[PDB]
Ligand binder design. Structure first.
Ligand SMILES: Cn1c(CCN2CCOc3ccccc3C2=O)nc2ccccc21
Ligand SMILES: [Mg+2]
Ligand SMILES: [Zn+2]
Length: 313
């Protein structure tokens, strides 16, 4: 009850910033997560022993893939922590509980392969979940872990509050399917610009949480350039392995996934910044002005990729 997590001074200060990198010491990531829950939610939100058992079972159900790993989980939760801390009064008690957990769980049991690859492979999960294949899986793994003995971090909630938090988590995890991001953001753009955006409308809150989930999920592009650049290596290490596996199925992969087309990476990053990232953080900044540092950091990294194409690096 009286037991705070405390971080060294440099982390205590930098963890509050959007561009914080959680560092290479894996053993400190559980502690960093608990710290963020305690400041974001309260020391009373979860029973410490249940929360610790929950975190460690989540960690175990992430795989040793180059990018969609336990470090991604905690990184995406930190971006959500920074959004929630900069927007103190906009979110409910259940939202604060649900969203950090949603972010920690959002890529549970990821194999390093896209929905497209599972569908072309004819993976059993593509028969069980026809759209948002991996995301329905990640939600299913989240419910499985919550149901392990001593892992029910929500046990003090009422039956209807429990249903509400699991519903926040489900929609938040489904929203990380980038296929769903484009339509979600277009609707949020129209709603904001015609002035119809209403944060008391649940269907509107759902849309805004979805965009937050995309923003946190993509937050590699909002880090300082040396972090962004080195993270891109891990992202492409998965895509190129998927590309190799497409070639094994007799299917030319898209260029993004073809290791023979490394030279097209700088132009592909520009497309991604211009079509996905910048528009994502722009609409987020319009709805939640204190998230502007994410857009600024994203624009700085766009300018760094432009310099790579100009052979300035
Ligand atoms: C479109 N696109 C990309 C985008 C890469 N990408 C896309 C999705 O994964 C991410 C998730 C979070 C943050 C960044 C990324 C990222 O770097 N690289 C490419 C190379 C050739 C052709 C098209 C390409
Ligand atoms: Mg995912
Ligand atoms: Zn993710």
């Amino acid at each position: 009850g009286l037991m705070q997590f405390t971080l060294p001074v440099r982390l205590c200060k930098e963890i509050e910033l959007f561009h914080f990198d959680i560092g290479p010491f894996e053993n400190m990531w559980p502690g960093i997560f608990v710290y963020m829950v305690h400041r974001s939610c309260g020391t009373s939100c979860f029973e410490l022993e249940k929360l610790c058992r929950f975190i460690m079972s989540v960690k175990k159900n992430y795989r040793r893939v180059p990018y969609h790993n336990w470090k991604h989980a905690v990184t995406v939760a930190h971006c959500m922590y920074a959004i929630l801390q900069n927007n103190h009064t906009l979110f409910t008690d259940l939202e604060r509980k649900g969203l950090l957990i949603a972010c920690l769980c959002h890529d549970l049991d990821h194999r390093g392969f896209s929905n497209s690859y599972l569908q072309k492979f004819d993976h059993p999960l593509a028969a069980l979940y026809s759209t948002s294949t991996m995301e329905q899986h990640h939600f299913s793994q989240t419910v499985s872990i919550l149901q392990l003995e001593g892992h029910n971090i929500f046990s003090t909630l009422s039956s209807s509050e429990y249903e509400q938090v699991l519903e926040i988590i489900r929609k938040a995890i489904i929203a990380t399917d980038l296929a769903l991001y484009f339509g979600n953001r277009k609707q949020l753009e129209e709603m904001y610009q015609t002035g119809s955006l209403n944060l008391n409308n649940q269907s509107h809150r759902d849309r805004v949480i979805g965009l937050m989930m995309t923003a946190c999920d993509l937050c590699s592009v909002t880090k300082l350039w040396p972090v962004t650049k080195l993270t891109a290596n891990d992202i492409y290490a998965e895509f190129w392995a998927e590309g190799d596996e497409m070639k094994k199925l007799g299917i030319q992969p898209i260029p993004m996934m073809d290791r023979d087309k490394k030279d097209e990476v700088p132009q592909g990053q520009l497309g991604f910044y211009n079509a996905v990232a910048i528009p994502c953080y722009t609409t987020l900044t319009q709805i939640l002005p204190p998230t502007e540092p994410l857009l600024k950091a994203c624009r700085d990294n766009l300018s760094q990729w432009e310099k790579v194409i100009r052979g300035e690096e």
